[PDB]
Amino acid sequence: VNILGLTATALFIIIPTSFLLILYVKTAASE
Amino acid sequence: VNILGLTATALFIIIPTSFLLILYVKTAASE
Amino acid sequence: SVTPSLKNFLLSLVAGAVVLAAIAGAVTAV
Amino acid sequence: IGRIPLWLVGTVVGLLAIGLLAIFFYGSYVGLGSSL
Amino acid sequence: IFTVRWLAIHAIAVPTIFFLGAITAMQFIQR
Amino acid sequence: MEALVYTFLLIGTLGIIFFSIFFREPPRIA
Amino acid sequence: ERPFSDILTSIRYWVIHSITVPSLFIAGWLFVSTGLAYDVFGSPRPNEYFTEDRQDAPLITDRFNALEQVKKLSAQ
Amino acid sequence: QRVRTVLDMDDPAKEETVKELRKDINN
Amino acid sequence: IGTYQEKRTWFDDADDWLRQDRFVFVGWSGLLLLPCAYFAVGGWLTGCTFVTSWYTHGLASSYIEGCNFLTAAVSTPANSLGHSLLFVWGPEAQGDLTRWFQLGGLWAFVALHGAFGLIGFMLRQFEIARSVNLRPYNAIAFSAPIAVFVSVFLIYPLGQSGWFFAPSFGVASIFRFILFFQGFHNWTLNPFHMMGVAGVLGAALLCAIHGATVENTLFEDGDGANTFRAFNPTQAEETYSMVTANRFWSQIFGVAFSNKRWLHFFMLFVPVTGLWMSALGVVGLALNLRAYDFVSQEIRAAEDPEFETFYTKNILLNEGIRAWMAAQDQPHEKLTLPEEVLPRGNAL
Amino acid sequence: SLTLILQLVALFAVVAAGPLVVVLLSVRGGNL
Amino acid sequence: AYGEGANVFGRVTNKSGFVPYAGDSFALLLPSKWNPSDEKEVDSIVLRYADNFDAVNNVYVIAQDTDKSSIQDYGSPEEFISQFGYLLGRQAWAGQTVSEGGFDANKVSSAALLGVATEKDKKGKTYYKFEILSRTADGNEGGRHQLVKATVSNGKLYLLKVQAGDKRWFKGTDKECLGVLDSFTVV
Amino acid sequence: KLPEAYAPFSPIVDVLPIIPVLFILLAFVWQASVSFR
Amino acid sequence: GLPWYRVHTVVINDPGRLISVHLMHTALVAGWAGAMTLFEIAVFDPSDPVLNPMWRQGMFVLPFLTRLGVTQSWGGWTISGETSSNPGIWSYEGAAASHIVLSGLLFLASVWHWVYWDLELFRDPRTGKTALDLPKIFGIHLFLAGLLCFGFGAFHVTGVFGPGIWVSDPYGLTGSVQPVAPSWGAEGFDPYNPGGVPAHHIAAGILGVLAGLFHLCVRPSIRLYFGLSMGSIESVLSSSIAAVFWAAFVVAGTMWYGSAATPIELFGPTRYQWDQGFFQQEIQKRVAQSTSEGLSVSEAWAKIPEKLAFYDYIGNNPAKGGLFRTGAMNSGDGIAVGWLGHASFKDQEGRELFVRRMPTFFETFPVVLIDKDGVVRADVPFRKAESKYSIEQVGVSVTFYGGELNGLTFTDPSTVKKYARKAQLGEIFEFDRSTLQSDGVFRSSPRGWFTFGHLSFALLFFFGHIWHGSRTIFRDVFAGIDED
Ligand code: CLA
Ligand code: CLA
Ligand code: CLA
Ligand code: CLA
Ligand SMILES: C=Cc1c(C)c2cc3nc(c4c5[nH]c(cc6nc(cc1[nH]2)C(C)=C6CC)c(C)c5C(=O)[C@@H]4C(=O)OC)[C@@H](CCC(=O)OC/C=C(\C)CCC[C@H](C)CCC[C@H](C)CCCC(C)C)[C@@H]3C
Ligand SMILES: CC(C)=CCC/C(C)=C/CC/C(C)=C/CC/C(C)=C/CC/C(C)=C/CC/C(C)=C/CC/C(C)=C/CC/C(C)=C/CC/C(C)=C/CC1=CC(=O)C(C)=C(C)C1=O
Ligand SMILES: CC1=C(/C=C/C(C)=C/C=C/C(C)=C/C=C/C=C(C)/C=C/C=C(C)/C=C/C2=C(C)CCCC2(C)C)C(C)(C)CCC1
Ligand SMILES: CC1=C(/C=C/C(C)=C\C=C\C(C)=C\C=C\C=C(C)\C=C\C=C(C)\C=C\C2=C(C)CCCC2(C)C)C(C)(C)CCC1
Ligand SMILES: CC1=C(/C=C/C(C)=C\C=C\C(C)=C\C=C\C=C(C)\C=C\C=C(C)\C=C\C2=C(C)CCCC2(C)C)C(C)(C)CCC1
Ligand SMILES: [Fe+2]
């Protein structure tokens, strides 16, 4: 799990940050 | 190279995809 | 046959029914 | 009705409880479980 | 009287002083 | 390899602390 | 409504509680001093703490015959 | 064959075997 | 109800007599909460003065043996009983209360009745919230104490060998159980446990900061130095300057709350999340699934005699804990470990 | 031992001195 | 659980801390706070007691058979001690080391003789009493004091040792150890 | 220890330390007796 | 508007999208099932069905495949040892393909139900507003549940039409899939008796059919309608999630304690079997028989099956891993290659010593040698200074019988210490480690991981049921209070 940890931590960072960023710019676009 | 290429491919398929999704949702939520 | 454990089970269940009846009586006796 | 003051009643109850706490703390230096 | 407050106070008043006197006798129990 | 990941993600954490401190949403008095 | 103020200051309440509380205290004293707790409870006294057979802590080590087992391992 | 010899053989290994937990009130 | 005649029956009479103003609210939930909670508290208070542990754990756990308040405990049943409920009528005791006490069956009795008391207390919260019609966020926050109770008093013994490894009802016995998880489970290094401790200390943060901030940004409402009487129970205006609070915390901390509702809900949110994650962690511990060993660090410590770390110090201290635990904490293993096999350092 | 009895009566003297003063001052006039 | 009253207002029963005990052809004082252990040390042990706090504070007896007439036939105290070196414990470490100091070569423990004695019984039998310090290279518990007493019954050579920690020796165990040592009377 | 002149006064002096804690308790008594004015 | 934690409440009152999202959840679950067993077949090693079984490789859905009757594979191998000459259409990855095509069909149906949401079926002819006939829907669903349960208990497990179930011997040696006759007595209520499962499902199906018919017949009353928040679909949600974490606690308990439908051969052992000396007691009474009548312990240890000795190992314990000792058990300790025999230790005078078995609670344990009478005779010396229990001075030799090493007596202190440390964990086995880069620590069984996940899920669903109970009874004052 030397680099399996890399890919797991990477996706665990990526999926919620992209999700939250998408819905945030949905909020901020409408004033 | 068996997993460093995997990490590079993952970063390449997410970071500009996420950036494009930011811009698209920023336009889609504005009418 | 009828085990002592089963006899104790029957006694416990009729005791629980008695407890439920006592609860009903205590709550209806204002 | 109010013949015995409420502060007096509280004082009696409090002194009973405090003296009883002192008795219980005395019971850690004698009796069972007192290292003697 | 025998009200709900009466029973609620008594069920926590009688046994606590019963065991309280028990502890009071129990402190002076010698070895 | 692990030290790079630890350092990068921790400096990202403190950087987003900085972002939330200074570049926050300004509240309104209305 | 008697909101815990007139009750404790009432001589009628105090007189009927001038007997019951000392009676409960005396009964609680005697319930331990006479050993009735030791009898109906199964708690071992310090004099009967150990039996002559075993000098160590008791071990039930059973699940179904534990009743008669604690009967023969207690202080009789 | 004898259950008492296998009892004393399981005991130094572990004291939680079911056969040690059953009919041990004689001990 | 529902603009229909609804002839009054036994259920209607019971409901009308039950949901009403008293000194203590009975209601429907009082059919279970009052007897179960009364039995639980009576059993525990009886156990800490009377119940000897000399036949369950081979210890002293009540005032009748000379123990104090902390060392007094309602002790768990013996592990030979496994996960039996130890009924007084059941095969363990068979109607004999006197030896049912010596079996430790009141541990299971009090734990069961306390679980039902927790259920009854949550049902009482729900029934009161229904009776006078506001949201049951008290029950929503109360969902975490029952999760902790289940996950540590039932889930852990049911996952392990038996109630003997369950915590006993008593302060020093809880301390024994806590050190038991410290040694056997490395509960400090467990991720869900760090989630929980972070949540609980953050709950202490929010409670202290909210009370201090509210009492320190209060409006005048005065002409008197005692600000407590400055509050009136019937007013529709703010009592503490929230905008001043927001400016103070924006300039002190960098961030501040812009909503009383979200502030109070996050104050609710931190300890319930912490306790739920701690419950999930002890649930994980229930099946011997721990965050005990870091594989790479133990490997490099194995092939490096100089590589000393605080983590390896903790690991070694934990096997020392367990080596000293086994003999005097597990009588049913009768582990007669000699003095020499016990690991120890130089001198001491 | 006589020291225990005189200790207990001294304790009684010091535990009663306060309540007697406050009770007598509460029943005799005021200004307290 | 028979019916009798509690013990109250009748003074204490035991405070000296010693409870008499007798076995086969011998009797001595045992500590009241000590618990006998089933871990038999040597193959010839009849009785063994130990402290519940630390297992170091232990004591046992030896009922080995004899081939001589008496301990006087064994001779001087040094010659008697020099034959029974198994009681202290052999070092299981065999590698040669000089990085420990203060001891002999390839040795991590030493037996420091603190004293010998010649104690007579009621009529003519001698009670050999000695004291041996059992240190280690690391000095665990600051060493260990060996308090040994020996005598001859009808056969069955009876030895004793009250082994205890040296920190316990100056922290409240020396008097109890001496009380155990001087009460080892064999008739 | 106490001398020949003050020998029976050891049970008297044995009670002296509890005066200030009993005194703050007396202050609570007085504040309760003035009905928490 | 609706926050991120309320997004799915866009379909609270839309039955077409409710059916659609249920369909696509069903599609995702079926697709995951197919993909998971494809991955498990791709990574499965059928090299040794006895010393490297599926639960030693972390196989999770494959033991459940082997539980209901699917034993062979299209790869020409069967887990029981036989060769699948004609495995049939229903293999492991064949069932995976069935799950995948079912997932595709369910996904297409979900898209269809999303694009066609305005269905007049969801409109009552009384007033035309959105409503669901919840009593009749539940009656119909209970009728189908009873019919399916009765069919599964009357044809699948009975074997007159289906394959039956996997039943093993008490000690988990042979194991077979066969039809099982129903047990209609208290033995049918024996949780370790497989004869109760057909009777259980038959009686449950009959009762469910009758209850569904009574629901289809009789309508509910006003009082329960206004009490249980019958008008809200969230009441159905709260009750159903209550039922499913009820079943989650049930499955966690039955997996941790073992039962008729929880075979050791397929799902691994239980920690209670190790703590109760089950396999050890079996081996030792198999030794007592045929040792008490001649042919002593020098031989007949080879008469002991190698699977039994593999079962008598604490590495085989499901509760010896960690929260983060991730993966297969073989990646933890290596793949077992052979049994070296039971170690018999003897000291210099002749008594037979035994190593103390490791309790499940410990990650490390000291090695001691105890006599028949129960007092420790030797130990691995930590101090080695003024110690008189060490093997180097006691003189204990170790001997082996019936394995790869038979009749070989080791006297060297280092090797007797090493093999005593190996026998501390139970039986003595050799493990290949360099093929999978074994770290050394023990992992956890699929049964243990199943129980942990389902216990956590059951706690989370208890929280969900409390929240949905609040939601059901308090559907009127969410946005605020009546302020009066
Ligand atoms: C709020 C009321 C209430 C409730 C819900 C419970 C619930 C419980 N008690 Mg408890 N108990 C109560 C009051 C209550 N108790 C009171 C007032 C007392 C003092 C007398 C006790 C004293 C007590 C003891 C000493 C023990 C329990 C125990 C238990 C648990 C198991 C009981 C059992 O084994 O059988 C279950 C009982 C029932 C389900 C009662 C229901 C009766 C059924 C529905 C009717 C069947 C009877 C019927 C008449 C059959 C006869 C037919 C015939 C005419 C042909 C259980 C959760 C045991 C325990 O805690 O385990 C460790 C235990 O040992 N209770
Ligand atoms: C099948 C059971 C079920 C169903 C149908 C629902 C349905 C609903 N819930 Mg609910 N809930 C459930 C179980 C369920 N819940 C459980 C078990 C819990 C305890 C944790 C909760 C706690 C809960 C809360 C606190 C709230 C709801 C709310 C809601 C409503 C809006 C949901 C939403 O849009 O949030 C959106 C959810 C997301 C955008 C993402 C959630 C996914 C998280 C981050 C984990 C990811 C999991 C992973 C991808 C898949 C794992 C699934 C598998 C392991 C089971 C909705 C009708 C809300 C409500 O009632 O409205 C006021 C509300 O706030 N639920
Ligand atoms: C009922 C749920 C369940 C259960 C019981 C199991 C059980 C098991 N799986 Mg499995 N799996 C599941 C669901 C499940 N799985 C799902 C839904 C997927 C699809 C994603 C997979 C995909 C999968 C693969 C690819 C593999 C397994 C494997 C295994 C076996 C190895 C042990 C293990 O899982 O590692 C340890 C388990 C844990 C560490 C649990 C984690 C506990 C929580 C979730 C921690 C994470 C929380 C935190 C917020 C995450 C942040 C981390 C981030 C920084 C990276 C084991 C028996 C392996 C195997 O043997 O092959 C079959 C294997 O290679 N599983
Ligand atoms: C054509 C129907 C069908 C069939 C024949 C199968 C067959 C199979 N499935 Mg499967 N499945 C199906 C539909 C089907 N599935 C659907 C629609 C889904 C999506 C939800 C799934 C999702 C799924 C998953 C995720 C998995 C399987 C798996 C499996 C295999 C092992 C089954 C198992 O062990 O799980 C156990 C099944 C049960 C325990 C069923 C219990 C039913 C519950 C407990 C009913 C209780 C509540 C009920 C309302 C009570 C009624 C009340 C009563 C009074 C009437 C097996 C070959 C497993 C596998 O190995 O993958 C290939 C697995 O991982 N399936
Ligand atoms: C050890 C810490 C601790 C204690 C003692 C405690 C105590 C209490 N919490 C309550 C409430 C709550 N707890 C809450 C959040 C929290 N509570 C926490 C920590 C605690 N809370 C934490 C950390 C949180 C954050 C999530 C909420 C949200 C609530 C409430 O709604 C409620 C309240 O209004 O607060 C004031 C009260 C209602 C209990 C009751 O009557 O149940 C009825 C049932 C009874 C009495 C039977 C229980 C018997 C037990 C289970 C078995 C016997 C145990 C013995 C009596 C004692 C054993 C003690 C030894 C183990 C040492 C009670 C005073
Ligand atoms: C190289 C480097 C970087 C070195 C350091 C590296 C290092 C060692 C890193 C490790 C640190 C690290 C992050 C590890 C911890 C890991 C871990 C435990 C993660 C935490 C997980 C976590 C999410 C926990 C969830 C549990 C839970 C929900 C708790 C959260 C706690 C929480 C945030 C509570 C709030 C705390 C707090 C500071 C309160 C301030 C709130 C506030 C501003 C109120 C003030 C206020 C009061 C009023 O009354 C009014 C009216 C107003 C208006 C107002 O404002
Ligand atoms: C369309 C189509 C098709 C195809 C289909 C397919 C191909 C499908 C599939 C699919 C798949 C292939 C699937 C899979 C999957 C998976 C899943 C679905 C999962 C998941 C998830 C989860 C649930 C998890 C969670 C978690 C994590 C994240 C980690 C660990 C922990 C936890 C658990 C938390 C067909 C031909 C048929 C038909 C026609 C067309
Ligand atoms: C057991 C049991 C039971 C039950 C019972 C009941 C239900 C009851 C009760 C009871 C109780 C309930 C008891 C008690 C006790 C109590 C106590 C013992 C107390 C206490 C307290 C204290 C001691 C404190 C004091 C104080 C002070 C001094 C200081 C300050 C203030 C205060 C107050 C804190 C029966 C028999 C049925 C059977 C089964 C088992
Ligand atoms: C030198 C000397 C002296 C002197 C002394 C002084 C300088 C003073 C004093 C005094 C005092 C000092 C007295 C007293 C008393 C007191 C008391 C007796 C108290 C009390 C109280 C209580 C017990 C309670 C309270 C409370 C609380 C806190 C809570 C709530 C409310 C109430 C009120 C309940 C004399 C002459 C004696 C003689 C001897 C020696
Ligand atoms: Fe506030």
Query: Can you tell me which atom of ligand 5 is nearest the CA of I272?
Result: 26
How far is CA I232 from each of CA B17, I227, I229, M483, rounded to the nearest angstrom?
Answer: 57, 11, 7, 18
I43 alpha-carbon distance from chain centroid: 18
SS3 K126: strand
- Measured between CA atoms, how close is D30 to chain E, in angstroms? 8
Q: Which among M252, M269, M318 is positioned nearest to M170, based on CA atoms? A: M269
**Can you read off the two tokens belonging to residue G61?**
């080590």
Q: Residue for token digits 């080879």?
A: M302
Contact M392, K92 (CB under 8 A): yes
Burial (CB count <10 Å: 0-12, 13-18, 19+), residue I183: buried
D28 alpha-carbon distance from chain centroid: 15
What distance in Å separates the CA atoms of residue M158 and residue M151, rounded to the nearest whole number? 10
| Ligand nearest, relative to CA of residue I44 | 5
Among candidates M222, M223, M463 on the partner chain, residue whose Cβ is nearest the Cβ of I276: M463
How many CA atoms within 13 Å lie on the side-chain side of M393?
18
User: Is H1's Cβ below 8 Å from some Cβ in M?
Assistant: yes
**Can you read off the two tokens belonging to residue K132?**
């041996």
Q: Residue for token digits 């439908």?
A: M261
Which residue ranges of M are tagged as binding site for chlorophyll a? 6-8, 67, 152, 189, 200, 467, 471
Among candidates K40, K94, K109 on the partner chain, residue whose Cβ is nearest the Cβ of M386: K109
* Three state DSSP letters for chain M: CCCHHHHHHHHCCCHHHHHHHHHHHHHHHHHHHHHHHHHHHHHCCCCCCCCCCHHHCCCCHHHHHHHHCCCECCCCCECCCCCCCCCCCCCHHHHHHHHHHHHHHHHHHHHHHHHCCCCHHHECCCCCCECCCHHHHHHHHHHHHHHHHHHHHHHHCCCCCCCCEEECCCCCCCCEEECCCCCCCHHHHCCCCCCHHHHHHHHHHHHHHHHHHHHHHCCCCHHHHHHCCCCCHHHHHHHHHHHHHHHHHHHHHHHHHCCCCCCHHHHCCCHHHHHCCHHHHHHHHHHHCCCECECCCCCCCCCCCHHHHHHCEHHHCCCCCCCCCCCCCHHHHCEEEEECCCCEEECCCCCEEEECCCCCCCCCCCCEEECCCCCEEEECCCCCCCCCCCHHHHCCEEECCCCCCCCCEECCHHHHHHHHHHHCCECCEEEECCCCCCCCCCCCCHHHHHHHHHHHHHHHHHHHHHHHHHHHHCCCCCCCCCCC
Query: What phi-psi label fits residue M269: left (phi over 0), alpha (psi between -120 and 50 degrees) or beta?
Result: beta
Contact M192, M97 (CB under 8 A): no
Task: Verify whether ligand 7 is closer than 6 Å to residue M241 (CB atom).
Answer: no
- Cβ distance G24 to E21 less than 8 Å, yes or no, reads yes
Angle at A28 between CA A24 and CA A31, to 5 degrees: 160
In sign, the C-alpha dihedral spanning M436, M442, M443, M447 is positive
**Can you read off the two tokens belonging to residue I65?**
């043996």
Q: Do chains D and F touch (3 or more CB pairs under 8 A)?
A: no
Facing residues of M346 across strands?
Answer: M352, M397
Contact I115, I33 (CB under 8 A): no
CA of I260 to the centre of ligand 10 (A): 7
- Method of determination is cryo-EM
Q: Which among M166, M183, M174, M137 is positioned nearest to M66, based on CA atoms? A: M166
- Cβ distance I89 to C27 less than 8 Å, yes or no, reads no
Phi, psi of A20 (to 5 degrees): -65, -40
What distance in Å separates the CA atoms of residue M67 and residue M268, rounded to the nearest whole number? 12
Facing residues of K185 across strands?
Answer: K27
Characterize I224-242 residue by residue with b for buried, 16 or more Cβ atoms within 10 angstroms of its Cβ, and e for exposed.
eeeeeeeeeeeeeeebbbb
- Cβ distance J19 to D8 less than 8 Å, yes or no, reads yes
DSSP-derived secondary structure letter, I77: P
Query: Can you tell me which atom of ligand 3 is nearest the CA of M444?
Result: 32
DSSP-derived secondary structure letter, I339: T
Q: Which among I133, I37, I261, I20 is positioned nearest to M470, based on CA atoms? A: I133
SS3 H25: coil
Contacts of M199 (CB under 8 A, 6+ apart): M153, M182, M183, M184, M188
In the sheet that holds M409-410, the strands lie side by side as M376-379, M368-370, M352-355, M344-346, M397-399, M409-410
**Can you read off the two tokens belonging to residue I287?**
């099946």
- Measured between CA atoms, how close is K187 to chain E, in angstroms? 33
How far is CA A4 from each of CA A11, B4, F2, F3, rounded to the nearest angstrom?
Answer: 11, 11, 12, 15
The CATH number that applies at residue G50 is 1.20.5.860
Contacts of K76 (CB under 8 A, 6+ apart): none
CA of I188 to the centre of ligand 9 (A): 48
CA of I89 to the centre of ligand 1 (A): 11
SS3 B13: helix
What distance in Å separates the CA atoms of residue I147 and residue M242, rounded to the nearest whole number? 15
Phi, psi of K119 (to 5 degrees): -105, 130
Q: Which helix (H) or strand (E) holds K21?
A: strand K18-22
SS3 K171: helix
Q: Which among M158, M155, M177 is positioned nearest to M167, based on CA atoms? A: M177
What distance in Å separates the CA atoms of residue I95 and residue C7, rounded to the nearest whole number? 11
What distance in Å separates the CA atoms of residue I94 and residue I90, rounded to the nearest whole number? 5
DSSP-derived secondary structure letter, K185: B
What distance in Å separates the CA atoms of residue M11 and residue M18, rounded to the nearest whole number? 6
Q: Which amino acid is at M101?
A: V
Q: Which among I234, I44, I96, I206 is positioned nearest to I141, based on CA atoms? A: I206
User: Is H23's Cβ below 8 Å from some Cβ in M?
Assistant: no
DSSP-derived secondary structure letter, K52: S
- Cβ distance E29 to G32 less than 8 Å, yes or no, reads yes
Q: Which amino acid is at I341?
A: V
CA dihedral M401, M406, M407, M412 (to 10 degrees): -100
Contact I26, I124 (CB under 8 A): no
List the domain boundaries for chain K. 1-187
Q: Which among M435, M206, M416, M481 is positioned nearest to M330, based on CA atoms? A: M435
Query: Can you tell me which atom of ligand 6 is nearest the CA of I242?
Result: 51
Comparing alpha-carbon positions, the chain I residue that sits nearest to M367 is I341
Angle at M26 between CA M22 and CA M29, to 5 degrees: 140
Q: Which among H9, H15, H18 is positioned nearest to M292, based on CA atoms? A: H9
H helices of G1-76, in order, are: 11-33, 36-41, 66-73
Q: How many domains does chain G have?
A: 1
Query: What phi-psi label fits residue M73: left (phi over 0), alpha (psi between -120 and 50 degrees) or beta?
Result: beta
Contact I166, I57 (CB under 8 A): no
Contact K28, K59 (CB under 8 A): no
Q: Which amino acid is at F27?
A: P
Q: Which among I118, I85, I122 is positioned nearest to I100, based on CA atoms? A: I85
How many CA atoms within 13 Å lie on the side-chain side of M81?
7
Q: Which helix (H) or strand (E) holds K47?
A: strand K45-51
**Can you read off the two tokens belonging to residue I63?**
């005032």
Considering only CB atoms, which chain G residues are within 8 Å of E26? 32
**Can you read off the two tokens belonging to residue I325?**
């635990």
How far is CA M55 from each of CA M134, M254, M327, M438, rounded to the nearest angstrom?
Answer: 43, 17, 11, 17
Q: Which helix (H) or strand (E) holds I310?
A: helix I310-329
Q: Which among I92, I11, I102, I88 is positioned nearest to I54, based on CA atoms? A: I102
Chains that contact J by 3+ CB pairs under 8 Å? D, L
Beta strands in K65-125 (DSSP E): 109-116, 119-120
- Cβ distance G62 to H15 less than 8 Å, yes or no, reads no
Q: Residue for token digits 């590589």?
A: I307
Tell me the pairing of strands M397-399 and M344-346. antiparallel
What distance in Å separates the CA atoms of residue M436 and residue B1, rounded to the nearest whole number? 20
Phi, psi of K157 (to 5 degrees): -55, 115
**Can you read off the two tokens belonging to residue A15?**
């999926």
Facing residues of K120 across strands?
Answer: K126
What distance in Å separates the CA atoms of residue M159 and residue I190, rounded to the nearest whole number? 48
Q: Which amino acid is at K135?
A: R
DSSP-derived secondary structure letter, I219: -
Any known ligand binding at G2? yes
Q: Percent helix, strand, coil in chain J (nearest 5)?
A: 80, 0, 20
User: Is M354's Cβ below 8 Å from some Cβ in H?
Assistant: yes
- Cβ distance D11 to J26 less than 8 Å, yes or no, reads no
What distance in Å separates the CA atoms of residue M140 and residue M225, rounded to the nearest whole number? 19
Q: Which helix (H) or strand (E) holds L22?
A: helix L19-33
Considering only CB atoms, which chain H residues are within 8 Å of M372? 8-9, 11-12
I:80-139 residues touching chain G, CB 8 A cutoff: 80-82, 84, 91-94, 96-99, 101-103
Q: Which among G20, G55, E29 is positioned nearest to I49, based on CA atoms? A: E29
Q: Which amino acid is at I207?
A: C
Q: What is the DSSP string of chain C?
A: ---HHHHHHHHHHHHHHHHHHHHHHHHH--
- Cβ distance K7 to G46 less than 8 Å, yes or no, reads yes
Q: What is the DSSP string of I107-157?
A: HHHHHHHHHHHHHHHHHHHHHHHHHHT---HHHHHHHHHHHHHHIIIIIHH
Q: What is the DSSP string of I252-299?
A: HTS---S-HHHHHHHHHHHHHHHHHHHHHHHHHHTTT--S---HHHHH
- Cβ distance G8 to D2 less than 8 Å, yes or no, reads no
Task: Verify whether ligand 6 is closer than 6 Å to residue I273 (CB atom).
Answer: yes
Longest dimension (CA), chain C: 46
SS3 D13: helix
Question: Range of G57's domain?
Answer: 4-73
How far is CA I311 from each of CA G61, I325, K31, K81, M281, rounded to the nearest angstrom?
Answer: 38, 21, 42, 47, 39
- Hey, what long-range contacts does I315-319 have (CB within 8 A, 24 or more apart)? I315/I186, I316/I343, I318/I182, I318/I183, I318/I184, I318/I186, I318/I292, I319/I343, I319/M363, I319/M364
**Can you read off the two tokens belonging to residue M246?**
């009820």
Query: What phi-psi label fits residue K89: left (phi over 0), alpha (psi between -120 and 50 degrees) or beta?
Result: left
Considering only CB atoms, which chain E residues are within 8 Å of D30? 27-28, 30
Contact I36, I110 (CB under 8 A): no
Characterize M245-262 residue by residue with b for buried, 16 or more Cβ atoms within 10 angstroms of its Cβ, and e for exposed.
beebbebbbebbebbbbb
Q: Which among K159, K167, K126 is positioned nearest to K41, based on CA atoms? A: K159
Q: Which among M367, M361, M265 is positioned nearest to M320, based on CA atoms? A: M361
Contacts of E1 (CB under 8 A, 6+ apart): none
Q: Which among M157, M162, M178, M160 is positioned nearest to M80, based on CA atoms? A: M178
CA of C30 to the centre of ligand 1 (A): 24
Contact G6, D1 (CB under 8 A): yes
**Can you read off the two tokens belonging to residue M251?**
């499955």
What distance in Å separates the CA atoms of residue M80 and residue M265, rounded to the nearest whole number? 10
CA of M441 to the centre of ligand 3 (A): 18
What distance in Å separates the CA atoms of residue M34 and residue M91, rounded to the nearest whole number? 12
Among candidates K2, K8, K38 on the partner chain, residue whose Cβ is nearest the Cβ of G33: K8
Facing residues of K34 across strands?
Answer: K51
DSSP-derived secondary structure letter, K81: H
